[PDB]
Swiss-Prot record, chains A, B:
<feature type="binding site">
    <location>
        <position position="145"/>
    </location>
    <ligand>
        <name>an all-trans-polyprenyl diphosphate</name>
    </ligand>
</feature>
<feature type="binding site">
    <location>
        <position position="74"/>
    </location>
    <ligand>
        <name>Mg(2+) 2</name>
    </ligand>
</feature>
<feature type="binding site">
    <location>
        <position position="199"/>
    </location>
    <ligand>
        <name>an all-trans-polyprenyl diphosphate</name>
    </ligand>
</feature>
<dbReference type="GO" id="GO:0046872">
    <property type="term" value="F:metal ion binding"/>
</dbReference>
<keyword id="KW-0809">Transit peptide</keyword>
<comment type="similarity">
    <text>Belongs to the FPP/GGPP synthase family.</text>
</comment>
<dbReference type="GO" id="GO:0009536">
    <property type="term" value="C:plastid"/>
</dbReference>
<keyword id="KW-0934">Plastid</keyword>
<dbReference type="GO" id="GO:0004659">
    <property type="term" value="F:prenyltransferase activity"/>
</dbReference>
<feature type="binding site">
    <location>
        <position position="74"/>
    </location>
    <ligand>
        <name>Mg(2+) 1</name>
    </ligand>
</feature>
<feature type="binding site">
    <location>
        <position position="35"/>
    </location>
    <ligand>
        <name>isopentenyl diphosphate</name>
    </ligand>
</feature>
<keyword id="KW-0479">Metal-binding</keyword>
<comment type="subunit">
    <text>Homodimer.</text>
</comment>
<dbReference type="GO" id="GO:0052924">
    <property type="term" value="F:all-trans-nonaprenyl-diphosphate synthase (geranylgeranyl-diphosphate specific) activity"/>
</dbReference>
<dbReference type="GO" id="GO:0005739">
    <property type="term" value="C:mitochondrion"/>
</dbReference>
<keyword id="KW-0460">Magnesium</keyword>
<dbReference type="GO" id="GO:0009507">
    <property type="term" value="C:chloroplast"/>
</dbReference>
Amino acid sequence: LDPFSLVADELSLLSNKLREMVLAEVPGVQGKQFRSTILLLMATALDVTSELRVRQRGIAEITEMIHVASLLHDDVMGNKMSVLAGDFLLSRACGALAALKNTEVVALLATAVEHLVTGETMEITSSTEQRYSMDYYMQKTYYKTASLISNSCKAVAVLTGQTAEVAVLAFEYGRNLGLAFQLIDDILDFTGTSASLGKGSLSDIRHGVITAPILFAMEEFPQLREVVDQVEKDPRNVDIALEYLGKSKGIQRARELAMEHANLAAAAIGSLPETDNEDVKRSRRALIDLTHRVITRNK
Amino acid sequence: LDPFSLVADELSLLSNKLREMVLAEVPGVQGKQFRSTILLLMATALDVTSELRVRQRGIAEITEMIHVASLLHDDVMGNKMSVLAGDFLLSRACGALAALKNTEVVALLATAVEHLVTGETMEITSSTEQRYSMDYYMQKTYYKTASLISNSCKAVAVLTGQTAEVAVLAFEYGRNLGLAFQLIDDILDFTGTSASLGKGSLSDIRHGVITAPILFAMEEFPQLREVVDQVEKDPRNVDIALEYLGKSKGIQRARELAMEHANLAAAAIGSLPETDNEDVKRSRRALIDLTHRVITRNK
């Protein structure tokens, strides 16, 4: 029915198991939902038992641990204790991972963490010319936002003993849905729920974070580049930038790019081995509908 | 002959393999020595092949990666890029670890990284009463300095398919030699190579880092505690503190504690299964002599 309500039970379990948080001290859930939901649906969308359901859920918890650990480090509660918390988290994720008794999966999330660093480094170590390139943008975007979801999707495949070919398909779904999700985010930051340019929260542009819509606008307005570079010397530069954006096809181009990607995801699901399991079919349908929802969301 | 020169070849290999550092950019070795040497000697001190020598060397490289990653995070090149480098390193260590095809070993270094965080947290989150306790001190000291070497030593055992009992012995050697090494460091920071109180570099006390010698001195001079708390308001408090230290048996007590520990290490080597391999014997002898050297070093 609804991609989420289809796996709402397996999600409740993870909300509960998050009660590991019961250590005495003497003296926004949409994010978690999206990633775990993908991983759970993906799990029931490959034909292979409650002992696997648990291993497969584990990947979901590991993914959220690695993720949170990513947020903390990004901040740098006080810098050093942010760093600690994050490392604590990474350690446990590495523990839980060894607990799944699979070396290939361990290798996959290791690589996920590596890409995440690579992407953060590209954000931090880019030349202006890199900062204004769509190619570099999409690359960094892959590493920073999509690698975690893709590699996780592969790990749910590998841990279910799927073909090496079906495994690149899980990956593909995750990579493309991931990119699409990020491109739609970039858009909503400008348009908000209101679907109106300017009524968005505008936190990216306000902080010198150049994204897809502006990058495409730069293609048709070379004047934009210098304006955006002073987007912190005077708020009015943000105003000016938005006017150029509104005269361009940037929001539009970014949305058509997101759609192309959500399609490649849907396509990957459509390339999966045929199956007669009415429950596998239903999962697969949920994965496809998810691609449509990433595109139409206003939040 | 000399614990080091006995494994100088296997060390050269690791110095070479550190040439992985050959990525084009278009446009103090005593530490490494001690840890790797222990891990290498330990490897040839358990009766079990060049395919193992390599796996066992891997643990040595992983240990140094995790370590360096520890130094970087401790600093928090610029905070965030310190954090990145460190995470990069952790990722690779987790990669190389999965490459060894052993889940138990993965679990061990995960726990090592966890203790390391725990120790850093104890340094950062201690109540004054904790800061002046020898018990808390030794605990934190274990986590922060010894857990990495012990867990690594266990991993060299586990990866050589030794008994679960011989494995706690490798661990024991590493834990105790580790603690002893740290206690001797604390001492040398006050006495320097000169073996004279005051001629040391004094960086711990100069920066409000209270260590074993001062902790034991506090036992016999309750006046010391407030003096040490103002060791940064006026340099002369460091002077004053050292006079109390010099009237106490603190340096002495810390050294007798280091010796007790280096002994428990030697003891663990002496508890290993008998063997007729003249090369295993020789390794074991090297591990024992190492315990004596940690105690007599002036650098």
